[PDB]
Write an enzyme that holds these catalytic residues in place. Sequence first.
Site, PDB file in Angstrom:
ATOM      1  N   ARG A 169       0.817  -1.211   0.000  1.00  0.00           N
ATOM      2  CA  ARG A 169       0.000   0.000   0.000  1.00  0.00           C
ATOM      3  C   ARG A 169       0.856   1.270   0.000  1.00  0.00           C
ATOM      4  O   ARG A 169       0.414   2.332  -0.439  1.00  0.00           O
ATOM      5  CB  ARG A 169      -0.921  -0.023   1.229  1.00  0.00           C
ATOM      6  CG  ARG A 169      -0.176  -0.303   2.521  1.00  0.00           C
ATOM      7  CD  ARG A 169      -1.105  -0.590   3.700  1.00  0.00           C
ATOM      8  NE  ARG A 169      -1.631   0.626   4.308  1.00  0.00           N
ATOM      9  CZ  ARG A 169      -2.039   0.705   5.569  1.00  0.00           C
ATOM     10  NH1 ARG A 169      -1.979  -0.365   6.352  1.00  0.00           N
ATOM     11  NH2 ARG A 169      -2.505   1.849   6.047  1.00  0.00           N
TER      12      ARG A 169
ATOM     13  N   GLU B  27      -6.964  -1.542  11.004  1.00  0.00           N
ATOM     14  CA  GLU B  27      -8.416  -1.360  10.901  1.00  0.00           C
ATOM     15  C   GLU B  27      -9.283  -2.561  10.505  1.00  0.00           C
ATOM     16  O   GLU B  27     -10.304  -2.811  11.144  1.00  0.00           O
ATOM     17  CB  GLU B  27      -8.752  -0.179   9.979  1.00  0.00           C
ATOM     18  CG  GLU B  27     -10.262   0.082   9.854  1.00  0.00           C
ATOM     19  CD  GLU B  27     -10.592   1.331   9.050  1.00  0.00           C
ATOM     20  OE1 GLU B  27     -10.012   1.503   7.958  1.00  0.00           O
ATOM     21  OE2 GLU B  27     -11.439   2.134   9.503  1.00  0.00           O
TER      22      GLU B  27
HETATM   23  N1  LIG Z   1     -10.265   2.872   5.489  1.00  0.00           N
HETATM   24  C1  LIG Z   1      -9.230   2.584   4.853  1.00  0.00           C
HETATM   25  N2  LIG Z   1      -9.140   2.973   3.502  1.00  0.00           N
HETATM   26  C2  LIG Z   1      -8.075   2.742   2.643  1.00  0.00           C
HETATM   27  N3  LIG Z   1      -6.971   2.089   3.046  1.00  0.00           N
HETATM   28  C3  LIG Z   1      -7.020   1.692   4.363  1.00  0.00           C
HETATM   29  C4  LIG Z   1      -6.004   0.999   5.020  1.00  0.00           C
HETATM   30  C5  LIG Z   1      -6.453   0.803   6.308  1.00  0.00           C
HETATM   31  N4  LIG Z   1      -7.685   1.332   6.479  1.00  0.00           N
HETATM   32  C6  LIG Z   1      -8.052   1.892   5.272  1.00  0.00           C
END
Ligand SMILES: Nc1ncnc2cc[nH]c12
EC number: 2.4.2.7
Lengths: 181, 181
Positions: A62, A99
Amino acid sequence: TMSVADAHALIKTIPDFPTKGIAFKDLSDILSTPAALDAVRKEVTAHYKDVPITKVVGIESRGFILGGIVANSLGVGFVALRKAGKLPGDVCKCTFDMEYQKGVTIEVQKRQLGPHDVVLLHDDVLATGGTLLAAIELCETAGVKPENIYINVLYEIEALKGREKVGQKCTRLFSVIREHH
Amino acid sequence: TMSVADAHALIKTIPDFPTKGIAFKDLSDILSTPAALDAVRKEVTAHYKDVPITKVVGIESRGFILGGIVANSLGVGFVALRKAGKLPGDVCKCTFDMEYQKGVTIEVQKRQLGPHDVVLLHDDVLATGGTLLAAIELCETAGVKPENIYINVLYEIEALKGREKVGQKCTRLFSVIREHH
Ligand SMILES: Nc1ncnc2cc[nH]c12
Ligand SMILES: Nc1ncnc2cc[nH]c12
């Protein structure tokens, strides 16, 4: 010429992705639009113009795309931090939670970082900050000094107060874009 | 100033990785050494100086680092091709097999490519060519014309004759470094 705000306008919010209840921030259109990518790249490089960075450490796939671009722009080497099993050779490891995934293991090749390095950690999105906190830890176990770590993220979701979470280990955090209120 | 040959000398061959019987080419030290990364980046950019590329398509995380650098250097947008489940929104898919993994599914966001694009596909290593062949297919299903696809790889393991395999779909293949005999 596009501005950072124009880049911001290219972001799409995808509901229930990858799993329901998660508001995913799709940064893809900034990366596929050269003027938007230049705007964001310039913002980061200008910001660290006077910081003696020696390496950019991209946090997982990422963070590879803009991470590599920033490294080459600054004229420093790029070092990948990846989930366990992907990097060969001697490695330092650490386990954390993000998350929408709990129980992840990150690694860095031991030889790529050490006491002499001034690291710019780069992540695409700052959410809970669990990944970043783990990344700082890894860099420090590899020998990087706490005062020699800087953090840059493309997009910050302030609502999740990841900044304060990460602030326990690193308070030099620069986000290019912050989610609109 | 380092040359491409110097970059080549930084590559390490790791035996039995990730699984036994696989000779892994570790390109990490080229990426963490700015002079080596510049040498390789310059070789690629000079090569496509007169080609009207409109997008660089990095093949999986393995192709994100230099892929992004080349895209920004050429002044074109970067588009990620990833294993299924990682990209949000409407996507085109295809299933293939690579040197140490059989049954992989790749995807690309439908909106990122189409008939007007001249694509530079980038992959870090050309082995069996299964991943590249699948990537060309994906680009074509998204609307890119066969004659508008070019391929660049950082390192080519000629022994596995991936070049001929990929030659069924694309014969415009430029490798920066080739494995020593
Ligand atoms: N809400 C989110 N949106 C995009 N990438 C990530 C990576 C962790 N949480 C994310
Ligand atoms: N032998 C090999 N070495 C490094 N990367 C890859 C990717 C596929 N095969 C590989």
